[PDB]
Design a binder for this molecule. Structure first.
Ligand SMILES: O=C(CC(c1ccc(F)cc1)c1ccc(F)cc1)Nc1cccc(F)c1CC[C@H]1CNCCN1S(=O)(=O)c1ccccc1
Ligand SMILES: [Cl-]
Ligand SMILES: [Cl-]
Ligand SMILES: [Cl-]
Ligand SMILES: [Cl-]
Lengths: 99, 99
């Protein structure tokens, strides 16, 4: 699809068999989701935002659907204000910025 | 143009007679620029997200040139780690997400 930016580009994602809302964010290097249970081992990661740095849990090769487009990749879990789909997954679904 | 998301979508902008590098950020509602002088009245505002909040100065009706496209809108000025072009100005240059 083609998504304008007059409102937040919020889309439905499916992760761990559950539907959630997430923001398509070109300004985010990685994907970060609110607290949830994910399988496997996690690795430590620090991400920086507008107000400073936060610690998150990094899970790899996680299956996730974004607006019905299938992706498998790195998902970070931590104290994020909203679920954010960053460039790591936007590139997987072939998302581009156009003007 | 068509901007892919393999790397950070950094562009050159012209604001208040200065050239700056800024990130095209669909996840940001507002445009936030590092400390600089802007003309006119301003009001304080708090903006937040990953890492918490920061205090900024809100200037209205500011002209910005993004990739040669002229846009007018509110610009927040404060201690941001990166200059951000948010949705309030991305809509003005007719920027869309496509996949
Ligand atoms: O990719 C990064 C680092 C990045 C950055 C971007 C913006 C920013 F404000 C702070 C850092 C960066 C760092 C240094 C540099 F020179 C160029 C870019 N961050 C990261 C990684 C995974 C996930 C993730 F969410 C984030 C944060 C994304 C940002 C920007 N898009 C909106 C959501 N946020 S926010 O800080 O919450 C925010 C909220 C309201 C207004 C403005 C920013
Ligand atoms: Cl959707
Ligand atoms: Cl990934
Ligand atoms: Cl505005
Ligand atoms: Cl439009």
């Amino acid at each position: 699809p083609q998504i304008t930016l007059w409102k937040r580009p919020l889309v439905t994602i499916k992760i761990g068999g559950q539907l959630k809302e997430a923001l398509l964010d070109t300004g985010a290097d990685d994907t970060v989701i609110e607290e949830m249970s994910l399988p496997g081992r996690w690795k430590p990661k620090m991400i920086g935002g507008i107000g400073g740095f936060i610690k998150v849990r990094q899970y790899d090769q996680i299956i996730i659907e974004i607006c019905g487009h299938k992706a498998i990749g790195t998902v970070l879990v931590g104290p994020t204000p909203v679920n954010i789909i960053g460039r790591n997954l936007l590139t997987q679904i072939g998302c581009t910025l156009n003007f």
